[PDB]
Amino acid sequence: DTTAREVMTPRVDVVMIEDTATLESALAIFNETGFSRIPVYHERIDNIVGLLNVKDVFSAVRQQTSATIRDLMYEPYFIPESKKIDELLKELQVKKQHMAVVLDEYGSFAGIVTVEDMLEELV
Amino acid sequence: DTTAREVMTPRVDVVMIEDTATLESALAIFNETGFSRIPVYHERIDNIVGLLNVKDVFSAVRQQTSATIRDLMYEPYFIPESKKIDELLKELQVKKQHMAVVLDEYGSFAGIVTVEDMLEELV
């Protein structure tokens, strides 16, 4: 009966980027941290508007273009803190997505849960 | 009691690259196929010597250097076809690795199993 909040990486520890940032800044963030996916926020940290994959950023430099983070980002899968991870694991598998964004009772950013977070429970 | 061979992507369907290839060729392979990890073989397809992550290839162009695939590739986790996926899932989690290389009774390349292959069993 484990829930998302029990395995999530909390907001305070999440590497993020603003949708106004450049792709060069995003590449620097990806390189320094090593993560493959970083949430994208608009104005406020609690306003998650997308996720940014390092792949899409590297492939866009294809060729140098007018690509903005808002164009390369994709919609996240938002879930409540009470979501049971046995359901989340199957749901992420159907979507072929690695990361879900956890929201609190106010609909604000609480943290993230990846498949690796859920599998960490099983040793 | 499901085994690796029952969920693996067979050799015939695996995108690979030779350790003599250039990093530019590897980037082209990653872009056309979309995969994040491709096995590396030496001389013969059945002689898997490493795995190549698109991240390490993109980060090496850091700066243009004398990087060879043999330098950027890492050791794979080899398993038999009879390996039970319940054990493999936990083993990959401990290693933080996404892909395992399946070998046949002759120790030759049979296929690959990723976490997504094992999770596909659960819907």
Ligand SMILES: Nc1ncnc2c1ncn2[C@@H]1O[C@H](COP(=O)(O)OP(=O)(O)OP(=O)(O)O)[C@@H](O)[C@H]1O
């Ligand atoms: N942007 C991020 N900020 C903070 N923690 C993150 C971030 N992305 C992933 N994590 C955490 O890192 C740990 C490993 O997650 P995961 O393996 O899915 O990410 P990754 O190593 O970036 O990706 P991958 O293995 O698919 O290349 C988990 O705890 C996950 O919560």
Ligand SMILES: Nc1ncnc2c1ncn2[C@@H]1O[C@H](COP(=O)(O)OP(=O)(O)OP(=O)(O)O)[C@@H](O)[C@H]1O
């Ligand atoms: N190099 C490859 N050649 C053929 N099939 C592959 C290859 N890499 C992965 N697959 C298959 O693709 C499917 C999805 O695997 P997986 O999600 O681990 O890979 P990916 O999409 O390349 O990586 P990721 O989601 O970590 O960026 C699985 O069937 C896996 O067997």
Ligand SMILES: [Mg+2]
């Ligand atoms: Mg995938």
Ligand SMILES: [Mg+2]
């Ligand atoms: Mg709370």
Ligand SMILES: [Mg+2]
């Ligand atoms: Mg990881």
Ligand SMILES: [Mg+2]
């Ligand atoms: Mg056989």
